Symmetry: C3
Subunit: 93 residues, 3 copies
Amino acid sequence: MDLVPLKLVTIVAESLLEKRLVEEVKRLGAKGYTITPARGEGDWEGQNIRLETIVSEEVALRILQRLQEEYFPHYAVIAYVENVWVVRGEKYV
Amino acid sequence: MDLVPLKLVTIVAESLLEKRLVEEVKRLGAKGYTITPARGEGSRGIRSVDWEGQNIRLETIVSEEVALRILQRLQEEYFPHYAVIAYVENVWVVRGEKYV
Amino acid sequence: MDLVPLKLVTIVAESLLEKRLVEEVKRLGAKGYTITPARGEGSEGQNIRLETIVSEEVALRILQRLQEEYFPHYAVIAYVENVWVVRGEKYV
Ligand SMILES: [Cl-]
Ligand SMILES: [Cl-]
Ligand SMILES: [Cl-]
């Protein structure tokens, strides 16, 4: 069993911000990401996306700080982080 | 870095329940929510014409106290009549003070 | 309040793997699951995210099997989170 502790960062925002956000997390160290369509107050196309990425503790805070600084003031964004244990997670570090 | 500890409550149920579940969490104190598609065990996919057979997942960021109020309400009012999944997880949230 | 601690195992993989993965988690002890569409870089010809609430022992059994049988041959992501579940006794 190769299981290691990492962080799962989740971001919810308009789907139109996808390219920018995907670029931001890769730029900050993320080695992958998963997207799920999503919606909120007020159909799965043209709404929001839930972007998730598995990263190390340090990269997680880099991403969150970048979102708080550059995206939160100008867009409706939700961002949070959870603790996870990942199979062969060494690769995401 | 404005990060605070909160709870993420997740509810999975039939799609027709969306309106009532949203009203219910807002009534109990949640300030926002996110809906995503869910299926499995026979349920219909995201592109199906059959909307009734589709499920939805509702996620909401709330305080510890509001989380259990929501979970209790689900256990009392919804679980007895619908196939529902509901759980809670610990999260640290950017600018989370607005969800309390 | 009927709330108990369990584990939430998440697996992201090619959608054609759905059938095999569902059978694998059921075989190893999972008493239910949910599937949600998922897409990654380069976006059916798509992925799925399988989630299952299980006991801590069943979670490790599932993850072990994924590492052995699937990770070497397919592009898969698998992880576990701690969760407290309403009427969770039914998943153990
Ligand atoms: Cl954490
Ligand atoms: Cl918790
Ligand atoms: Cl855990």
